[PDB]
């Protein structure tokens, strides 16, 4: 099929000249666009007469209803939009599209050529006729007889511009999406354009394409491929040092990934604890709220408080309260609600069912209660904002305690792994007790559960070594002293063993220099880990005891580690996403969620 | 800095009027684009007089030497080429590029606009003149006095087409790269186009950009991010099944990766064996070349021959010959040549230095000689074709309990790991850990504790019947980071998931597996005994394709790759590329070697057919 589209100005003979472009083969369909000016009407009648005879191919004539003459740029946009829609409707297939720029204003020809290039056409040409017509033999043919004489005299010279590929994202635009109004009055189609949507869409597509092309070169220093579409100015802003104050709003909206969160350390004090206590099912076994004053300077302690004091800080919650089913469900729902506030797109809550199991509530019942509460809280949230939650069972050894709880927790995890396969699942076991525990963990690996190793109040480099190799771990928690063995900072980096760093937890437990101008020997080891290839993440540890969320941790990473580029923050998020204990469906959903990185709003300095 | 570029035609009053778009501001310099037609010479003289009587900003006139008048399309392409080059020479920066396209023909203005959009322009504007001039008071300005009175009377209604930001790969071009030759004739510069290299440059840039944008949506599915510049037809081609017959050349052209290539079976038979033998430093000490008839149909046996027989096929070479330094050097040089002839961008040759020791030659000396031979071979090759080769030491689990060689190999590996830090290096060990319920993978007994202690890697050789227990004992007790011939992995649905999650690569050898275990060939669908390549790939495992023993298997890396299309029905080309990328990513290289390998991998050879 061949459809020929041309615009006619003051001369109507252009269409007949182009009619014989390919010769006797002809064009199956011909469409002509013309202005509404009265001076064009005589040409319209002449062309109607010329079309009645030579009635071989189908014919139709289109006039721009709202355009008469070129007077300014507004009519410019008007006829540009009208021409775009007219060509879209009349030539749905680019391969069958032939266009001639002889007719219309010079700007009309330029705009039509631009439209062809942007949307594609089979061929573009301009028809020039010998001016051996009319009186004195010095004018172009302007009558039916003159046009016919020109056609049979081989006097038409065709300037074929060759194929025009079109544009990738704009080769599919169709008239139905951007319909054009046509009013029929005789044999002439009167065309009017409703809105400017198409031009705005084209401009946006072109701007996005140019941004993508500009950023295409460095497609490996961007953690997320979707960052390519970002404007070059935004990308340059991205690599600058992270400012803890001006970036609070942006870092608030990042879809984050929380991999180290304790369920028992969420509402240890404050209004959250009061809510948990009020939602209790049996408001008679609740222990008195013990007074546990916070250290001065909280949440930024003046000096470290050691691990033991840190744990003792949250003594109003946990096992000594969560044994009431109402309190447990209230705690779970409040934790999920707090997760939804920071736009956390994925989390792995760490819970210990045994600490909450009573005589009449076996640990399996408590774990099922928690899992189903979380599955509920997920199911009352739209998937476009849902925060998937997977559970980790903390199997912590007791200093002088009983291994019976460890057996309880390993068996519970092994059973929960197989029981559930959709929604909130049990992904792995956390070892908040690491020393070797080798044969105690052979069953866990045999069924394929992940294991994370929880380092706490420690300064040893053999614990980190035996975690990696004896009880094969896939994530190390709080391993702040790992460069002290240059042999292991090269196996953790080569085996992809993620290191979960908690800024506030590690600062409050131990304390590090803050907002230092230059890195020294006491600064936070985050950047040293990053530059060595380590998959270092950032988390919150205990949301309650630490008294701050993931956003605060990411923001204070700047003060703790000087000169950290927010691109490093995105790298940490991607590392967490790659380190999570997800499966194909959850992993794909998480990755689709991460691609929506919020745009900056103060990239002007 | 503000500049103006405009072509001129039969109406010479166009450039003067256009020069007042900024009005009283003026422009730093305006250049005139002109053709060789003689109908515009009076206009050129009028413009020269106007410039002389209106001094200040620099002025120039350029006439198209080869374009006298518009007759055919060739003049049009020449005009566009001249426009592009002249704009580059006079408008290297688009921030000061202002365009007025009043002059010329209809196609001249369209070419002006296309060039402006392609290379960007700060302002593109057109001039409309109110007809009030001439003797009849109806024509437009055509003389110097008419131009001046039109300017003063304000008969100009300029139109601004908007800014042209440009094109990312075409806004950085500089004039000197594509110089413009011009002949001076008084005040008018006579430009000339040396060639149309610029047009081809622009066309290539636009085509590559179109390919990038078309395949952009879905770059996460491309094994190599550099494939986004491939034509969409080629991207469709990649997603089709592989063909063993037509795809010989394309596979031969891939920059591949080798990870399972034993040095003791490279020249076990034939011309290579003779080349090795005649290189011995002690020709009279060479063991007699025995008779080792190959089974019929080799390298495609009509029935499986067994691991014992397969191993025995390599008697002519190995410990029999390689004790001689000359034979060792010949082996190394020929192996490197065989690698280069197959376009391998990274290899890990596993040797057994202790097996080649003598009374006067300690295992360390043999290892040093091998490493230095490979380093020399690497040094003489241009860096574009240099196949970075690392070494893996083999701790064979020979029956009987002999641990002298195993201990020696582990100690030698721990020593070489630090002795060398550039070029060819020792990167790990490849514990065989045989099957017979007495060695398995629990042979650890602290034997492999030191190798882990120093940061070395381990790669097991799951034998000819390990049965899921070996593949677990090795993964979870030896901390193996690769597994060889893990063909029964599908048995336990838990191992096929632990391997996928932990990212443990699986090394497969199509030809060796076919010749030893035997598999259905040329099948239409996938049955119980179908080769597990596609099964492993589906589950997410990181499967890699290698050669095992070059000499014994008598098939190079390309032969192994093409045999998958016969072993695994429906295997596609994109999956071959995915296997190459997995092999590259699962190798024991460091940052420098990995970066070189990744730079070498991006150069995928374009298909010869496309359909
Ligand atoms: N920040 C922390 N780092 C390491 N271990 C912690 C931390 N906070 C608590 N733990 C220990 O981890 C295990 C689980 O703690 P969780 O936060 O779930 O509270 P819990 O067990 O209910 O608290 P409690 O110590 O008051 O009985 C317990 O052994 C707890 O002592
Ligand atoms: N496909 C294979 N499967 C298992 N073991 C193998 C295989 N190929 C070689 N081996 C064993 O691994 C080692 C191979 O190393 P290499 O060939 O360099 O030494 P070699 O002593 O010269 O070998 P060979 O006995 O083959 O001549 C030898 O122990 C060989 O027995
Ligand atoms: Zn913790
Ligand atoms: Zn092997």
Residue in chain B nearest A104 by alpha carbon: B106
CA–CA distance from A343 to each of A377, A548, A578, B133 (Å)? 15, 15, 18, 70
Q: How many CB atoms lie within 10 A of CB B447?
A: 15
- Yes or no: say if A355 and A264 are a contact pair by the CB < 8 Å rule: yes
Q: Which of A69, A203, A421, A491 to mutate to test the interface with B (most CBs of B within 10 A)?
A: A491
Interchain contact, A209 vs B214, CB within 8 Å: no
Q: Identify whether B299 is preceded by a cis peptide bond (ω within 30 of 0).
A: yes
Nearest to A490 by CA among B389, B476, B392, B589: B589
Nearest to B299 by CA among B42, B548, B499: B548
Residue A418 CA, distance from chain mean position:
32
Cβ of B377 less than 6 Å from ligand 2: no
Quote the DSSP letter at residue B287.
P
Give CA–CA dist A395/A353, Å, rounded.
10
Q: Which residues contact B366 (CB under 8 A, 6 or more apart)?
A: B328, B353, B354, B356, B357
| DSSP reduced 3-state for B245 | coil
Any idea which ligand is nearest the CA of A311?
A: 1
User: Rg for chain B (alpha carbons), in Å?
Assistant: 36
Nearest to B188 by CA among B11, B40, B87: B40
Q: How far B592 CA sits from the closest chain A CA (Å)?
A: 13
Give CA–CA dist B554/B560, Å, rounded.
10
Beta bridge partners of A139: A133
Interchain contact, A487 vs B591, CB within 8 Å: no
Q: Is A356 annotated as a binding residue?
A: yes
- Yes or no: say if A321 and A285 are a contact pair by the CB < 8 Å rule: no
Q: What is the β-pairing status of strands B123-126 and B159-160?
A: antiparallel
Quote the DSSP letter at residue B172.
S
Cβ of B433 less than 6 Å from ligand 2: no
- A381, two tokens: 């949230």
Give CA–CA dist B324/B303, Å, rounded.
36
- B274, two tokens: 């003779």
- Yes or no: say if B16 and B147 are a contact pair by the CB < 8 Å rule: yes
Residue in chain B nearest A581 by alpha carbon: B501
Task: Please name the residue that has the structure tokens 């050349």.
Answer: B249
CA–CA distance from A326 to each of A275, A329, A332, A399, B19 (Å)? 11, 5, 10, 31, 82
Give CA–CA dist B102/B127, Å, rounded.
6
Cβ of B268 less than 6 Å from ligand 2: no
Residue B331 CA, distance from chain mean position:
30
Phi, psi of A558 (to 5 degrees): -65, -50
Quote the DSSP letter at residue B28.
S
- B184, two tokens: 């001076």
- Yes or no: say if B606 and B243 are a contact pair by the CB < 8 Å rule: no
Question: Residues A299, A303, A308, A311: what is their CA dihedral angle, to the nearest 10 degrees?
Answer: 0
Q: Which residues contact A304 (CB under 8 A, 6 or more apart)?
A: A508, A509, A510, A511
Nearest to B411 by CA among B450, B469, B378: B450
Q: Is B342 annotated as a binding residue?
A: no
Breaks (C-N over 2.5 A) in chain B follow: none
Residue nearest to atom 30 of ligand 1 (CA): A311
Interchain contact, B498 vs A107, CB within 8 Å: no
**Closest approach atom of ligand 2 to CA B322:** 22
Nearest to A67 by CA among A56, A53, A81, A49: A81
User: Which residue from B106, B453, B476 is facing A106, i.e. has the nearest CB?
Assistant: B106
- Yes or no: say if A428 and B474 are a contact pair by the CB < 8 Å rule: no
Task: Please name the residue that has the structure tokens 């009005």.
Answer: B23
- Yes or no: say if A598 and A250 are a contact pair by the CB < 8 Å rule: yes
Give CA–CA dist B523/A160, Å, rounded.
53
Beta bridge partners of A500: A477, A537
Nearest to A168 by CA among A82, A94, A81: A94
Cβ of A433 less than 6 Å from ligand 1: no
Interchain contact, A445 vs B167, CB within 8 Å: no
Give CA–CA dist A354/A364, Å, rounded.
9
Cβ of A506 less than 6 Å from ligand 1: no
Cβ of B548 less than 6 Å from ligand 2: yes
Cβ of A260 less than 6 Å from ligand 1: no
Quote the DSSP letter at residue B46.
H
**Residues across chain B:** 611
**Closest approach atom of ligand 1 to CA A398:** 29
Q: How far B215 CA sits from the closest chain A CA (Å)?
A: 9
- Yes or no: say if A541 and A500 are a contact pair by the CB < 8 Å rule: no
Q: Is A234 annotated as a binding residue?
A: no
**Closest approach atom of ligand 1 to CA A310:** 1
Distance A546 CA to ligand 1 centre (A): 13
Cβ of A456 less than 6 Å from ligand 1: yes
| DSSP reduced 3-state for A428 | strand
Kindly provide the resolution of this structure in angstroms, with one decimal: 3.2
CA–CA distance from A130 to each of A124, A139, A150 (Å)? 20, 8, 8
B109 contact residues in A (CB cutoff 8 A): 106, 109-110
A446 contact residues in B (CB cutoff 8 A): 472, 494
Task: Please name the residue that has the structure tokens 């009043």.
Answer: B102
Interchain contact, A496 vs B479, CB within 8 Å: no
State the DSSP H helix or E strand holding residue B553, giving kind and residue range, or none if neither.
helix B550-553
Residues with CB under 5 A from ligand 4 (ion): B 461
Give CA–CA dist B75/B30, Å, rounded.
25
B130 contact residues in A (CB cutoff 8 A): none
Give CA–CA dist A19/A189, Å, rounded.
20
Nearest to B42 by CA among B65, B81, B8, B88: B8
Residue nearest to atom 6 of ligand 1 (CA): A311
Interchain contact, A159 vs B107, CB within 8 Å: yes
Distance A261 CA to ligand 3 centre (A): 7
CA–CA distance from A369 to each of A318, A325, A361, A366, B339 (Å)? 16, 8, 10, 5, 61
Provide the terminal-to-terminal Cα distance of chain B, rounded to the nearest Å: 52
- Yes or no: say if A490 and A468 are a contact pair by the CB < 8 Å rule: no
Task: Please name the residue that has the structure tokens 């003049």.
Answer: B75
B454 contact residues in A (CB cutoff 8 A): 487
- A465, two tokens: 């070594």
The method recorded for this entry reads cryo-EM
- B214, two tokens: 């078309």
Give CA–CA dist A108/A112, Å, rounded.
6
Provide the terminal-to-terminal Cα distance of chain A, rounded to the nearest Å: 57
B209 contact residues in A (CB cutoff 8 A): 209, 213
| DSSP reduced 3-state for A11 | coil
Task: Describe the strand order of the beta sheet including A156-160 as a list of residue ranges.
Answer: A156-160, A123-129, A97-100, A3-8, A29-34, A58-64, A188-193, A180-185
Residue nearest to atom 10 of ligand 2 (CA): B311
Residue in chain A nearest B214 by alpha carbon: A168
Phi, psi of A293 (to 5 degrees): -55, 145
User: Which residue from B101, B225, B494 is facing A446, i.e. has the nearest CB?
Assistant: B494
Chain B residues with at least one Cβ partner in A under 8 Å: 72-73, 76, 101, 106-107, 109-110, 113-114, 117, 126, 159-160, 165, 167-169, 209-210, 212-214, 216, 219-220, 225, 228, 452-455, 457, 472, 476, 479, 481, 494, 497-498, 501-503, 540, 591
Residue in chain A nearest B219 by alpha carbon: A225
Cβ of B464 less than 6 Å from ligand 2: no
Q: Which residues contact A375 (CB under 8 A, 6 or more apart)?
A: A423, A424
User: Which residue from B106, B159, B479 is facing A101, i.e. has the nearest CB?
Assistant: B106
A584 contact residues in B (CB cutoff 8 A): 540
């Amino acid at each position: 099929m061949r459809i020929l589209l041309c615009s006619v100005g003051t001369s109507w003979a252009v269409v007949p000249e182009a009619m014989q472009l390919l010769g006797s083969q002809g064009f199956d369909e011909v469409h002509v666009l013309t202005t509404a000016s009265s001076k064009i009407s005589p040409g319209v009648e002449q062309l109607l007469r010329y079309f009645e005879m030579h009635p071989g191919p189908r014919f139709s004539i289109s006039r721009v209803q709202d355009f008469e003459d070129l007077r300014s740029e507004q009519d410019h946009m008007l006829f540009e939009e009208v021409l775009w829609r007219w060509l879209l409707q009349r030539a749905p297939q680019a391969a069958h599209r032939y266009i001639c720029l002889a007719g219309g204003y010079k700007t009309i020809s330029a705009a039509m050529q631009r439209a062809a290039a942007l949307f594609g056409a089979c061929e573009v040409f301009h028809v020039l006729c010998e001016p051996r017509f009319g009186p004195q033999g010095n004018r172009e043919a302007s009558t039916l007889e003159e046009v016919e004489q020109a056609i049979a005299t081989n006097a038409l010279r065709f300037v074929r511009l060759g194929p025009e590929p079109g544009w990738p994202q704009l080769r599919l635009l169709s008239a139905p999406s951007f319909p054009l109004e046509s009013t029929l009055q005789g044999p002439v189609h009167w065309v009017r354009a409703s809105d400017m949507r198409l031009r705005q869409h084209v401009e946006g597509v072109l701007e996005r394409s140019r941004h993508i092309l500009a950023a295409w070169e460095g497609i490996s220093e961007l953690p997320i491929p979707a960052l390519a579409a970002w404007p070059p100015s935004h990308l340059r802003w991205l690599h600058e040092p992270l400012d803890p104050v001006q970036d609070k709003a942006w870092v608030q909206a990042l879809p984050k990934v929380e991999l180290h969160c304790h369920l028992g350390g969420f509402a240890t004090h404050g209004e959250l604890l009061h809510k948990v206590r009020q939602e209790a099912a049996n408001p008679e076994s609740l222990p008195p709220v013990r007074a546990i004053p916070l250290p001065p300077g909280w949440p930024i302690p003046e000096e470290p408080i050691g691990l033991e004091r840190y744990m003792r800080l949250g003594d109003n919650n946990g096992s000594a309260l969560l044994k009431d089913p109402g309190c447990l469900r209230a705690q779970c729902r409040l934790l999920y609600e707090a997760l939804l506030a920071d736009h956390v797109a994925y989390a792995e809550i760490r819970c210990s069912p045994a600490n909450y199991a009573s005589a009449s509530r076996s640990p399996w019942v408590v774990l099922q209660e928690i899992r189903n509460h979380f599955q509920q809280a997920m199911e009352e949230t739209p998937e476009d904002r849902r925060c998937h939650v997977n559970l980790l069972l903390t199997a912590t050894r007791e200093e002088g305690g009983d291994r019976s709880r460890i057996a309880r927790h390993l068996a519970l995890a092994i059973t929960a792994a197989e029981h559930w396969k959709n929604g909130c699942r049990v992904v792995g076991v956390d070892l908040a007790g690491f020393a070797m525990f080798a044969t105690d963990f052979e069953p866990v690996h045999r069924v394929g559960l992940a294991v994370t190793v929880h380092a706490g109040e420690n300064d040893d480099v053999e614990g980190i070594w035996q975690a990696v190799f004896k009880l094969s771990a896939r994530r190390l928690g709080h391993a702040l002293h790992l460069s002290r063995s240059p042999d292991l900072l090269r196996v953790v980096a080569e085996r992809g063993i993620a290191v979960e760093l908690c800024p506030y937890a590690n600062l409050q437990i131990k304390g590090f220099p803050l907002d230092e101008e230059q890195e020294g020997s006491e600064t936070y080891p985050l950047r040293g880990y990053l530059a060595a290839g380590v998959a270092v993440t950032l988390n919150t540890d205990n949301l309650g005891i630490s008294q701050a969320s993931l956003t605060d941790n990411l923001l204070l990473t700047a003060r703790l580690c000087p000169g950290i580029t927010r691109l490093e923050v995105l790298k940490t998020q991607v590392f967490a996403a790659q380190a999570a204990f997800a499966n194909q469906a959850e992993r794909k959903a998480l990755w689709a969620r991460l691609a929506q990185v919020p745009v900056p709003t103060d990239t002007e300095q």
